[PDB]
Amino acid sequence: ETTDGVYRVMTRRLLGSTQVGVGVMQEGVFHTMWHVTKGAALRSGEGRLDPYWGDVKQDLVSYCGPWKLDAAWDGLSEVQLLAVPPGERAKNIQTLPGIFKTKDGDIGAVALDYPAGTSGSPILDKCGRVIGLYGNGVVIKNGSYVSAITQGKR
């Protein structure tokens, strides 16, 4: 199944079925975060998805093809995290991104906290386009979590 949409990334190597992450199928390419799969091959039913591209520093990996998602936050408008938490149904969460400021430039960040297995959930603009993936971030002085809006290059 190469059907577009959002997917859970599961394993049976631990206790029961365990969700390690989330990813986005678009244009026949599966997109997730590197720390989820560590670049390992994945199963989709009887079929196999082999990695195609990946980069530990960006913490991204694509399967069956090169990275396809190229929409970017406009720096002004609110976005929606399509959170897919372990054992719970997909739900959209709307928020106004903050900003990671780095020596190489700024990128948007969402201050939303979810189980680690939610890593890879897509972030969307108002037109429905994926502007990045959720799950690589920091922990603030308050103890809460803030994830970058991690987008690849096409």
């Binding site: 199944e1 059907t3 577009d4 949409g5 959002v6 997917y7 859970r8 990334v9 599961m10 394993t11 049976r12 190597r13 390690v20 990813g23 678009q26 599966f30 590197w34 720390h35 799969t37 390992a40 091959a41 994945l42 199963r43 989709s44 530990v56 520093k57 960006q58 609110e78 929606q80 399509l82 897919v84 149904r89 997909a90 739900k91 959209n92 969460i93 709307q94 928020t95 106004l96 991104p97 903050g98 900003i99 990671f100 400021k101 780095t102 020596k103 960040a109 201050a111 939303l112 897509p122 969307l124 603009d125 108002k126 037109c127 429905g128 690589n136 971030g137 920091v138 603030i140 803030v146």
Partner: protein, 39 residues
């Protein structure tokens, strides 16, 4: 081999979603291993 995927939904904006979460501006660094840290 050990990991598999299963569909969880369509990629769509939801007109009546809840609005929550802050908008902090944070000085961070990104190391070669792909970890952010607070500056």
């Amino acid at each position: 081999v050990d990991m598999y995927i299963e569909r969880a939904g369509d990629i769509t904006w939801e007109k009546d979603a809840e609005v929550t979460g802050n908008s902090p501006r944070l000085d961070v660094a990104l190391d070669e291993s792909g970890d952010f840290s607070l500056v």
